[PDB]
Amino acid sequence: KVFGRCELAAAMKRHGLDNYRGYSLGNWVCAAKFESNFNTQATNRNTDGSTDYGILQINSRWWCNDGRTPGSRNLCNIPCSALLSSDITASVNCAKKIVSDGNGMNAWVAWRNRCKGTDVQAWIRGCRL
Ligand SMILES: [Cl-]
Ligand SMILES: [Cl-]
Ligand SMILES: [Cl-]
Ligand SMILES: [Cl-]
Ligand SMILES: [Cl-]
Ligand code: NA
Numbered sequence: 001k002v003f004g005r006c007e008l009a010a011a012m013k014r015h016g017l018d019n020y021r022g023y024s025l026g027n028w029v030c031a032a033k034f035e036s037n038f039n040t041q042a043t044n045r046n047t048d049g050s051t052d053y054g055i056l057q058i059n060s061r062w063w064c065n066d067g068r069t070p071g072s073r074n075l076c077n078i079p080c081s082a083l084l085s086s087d088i089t090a091s092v093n094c095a096k097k098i099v100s101d102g103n104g105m106n107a108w109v110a111w112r113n114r115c116k117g118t119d120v121q122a123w124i125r126g127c128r129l
Contacts, residue, residue, distance in 0.1 A: 001086035003038040003055070005029065006127035008088075013129055015092040021099050025129075026120035027111065028095075032056060033123070034110035040091075041084050054083035054091045056108065063094055 003011070009029050012018070018025040035057040036042035044052045050061035050069045060069040064080035076094035083091050098107050105111045 001040045003032075003040070005033075005038070005123065006129075008032060008038055008055075009124045009127050010129055011088055012092065015089065017092060017095075020096060021104065023099065023105055024120065026123040027105060027115060029123040030115035030118070030120050031105065031108045031111040034114045035108060040086055040088065043084075051080065053080045055088060056083075056091050056095050057110075058083055058091065058094055058098070063098065 009025055012028050013025055017023075017028045032038055032055050036055045038055065040055050042054065042057065044057065046052065046059070046061070048061065050059055050072060051066060052059050053064065053066075058064060058076070058080075060066045060072055060080050062073045063076045064078050064083060065074040066080040076097055078090055078094065083094065099105055101107070105116070
């Protein structure tokens with residue numbers, strides 16, 4: 001599923017991401033835009049053999065099991081394929097664990113390089129929330 005901007009903002013708000021650990025909703029929409037272009041089916045392989053999955057590009061090195069990342073962890077206790085669903089619940093619940101692990105949203109490289117320090121409120125401007 002390719003979300004619209006305001007559609008995704010409303011779904012993330014219903015799932016409790018607005019101001020979660022102090023990160024306003026626009027931060028999460030901005031991260032999703034540049035990580036996946038709002039596409040739940042996005043995948044990308046990393047140099048070390050791990051793979052990033054879904055709308056927030058969560059990494060099989062630490063967070064999910066895909067059966068092909070030897071020596072990795074599965075800290076969200078899910079198969080990585082669950083992060084590709086049109087229902088974003090699994091991705092949101094795993095992202096909550098990631099952002100709580102000490103480094104905040106710096107875990108998302110695209111957030112750090114393209115959203116951090118910008119006017120992220122623009123990403124929810126005009127949306128009915
Ligand atoms: Cl857009
Ligand atoms: Cl915001
Ligand atoms: Cl594995
Ligand atoms: Cl949902
Ligand atoms: Cl933080
Ligand atoms: Na893994």
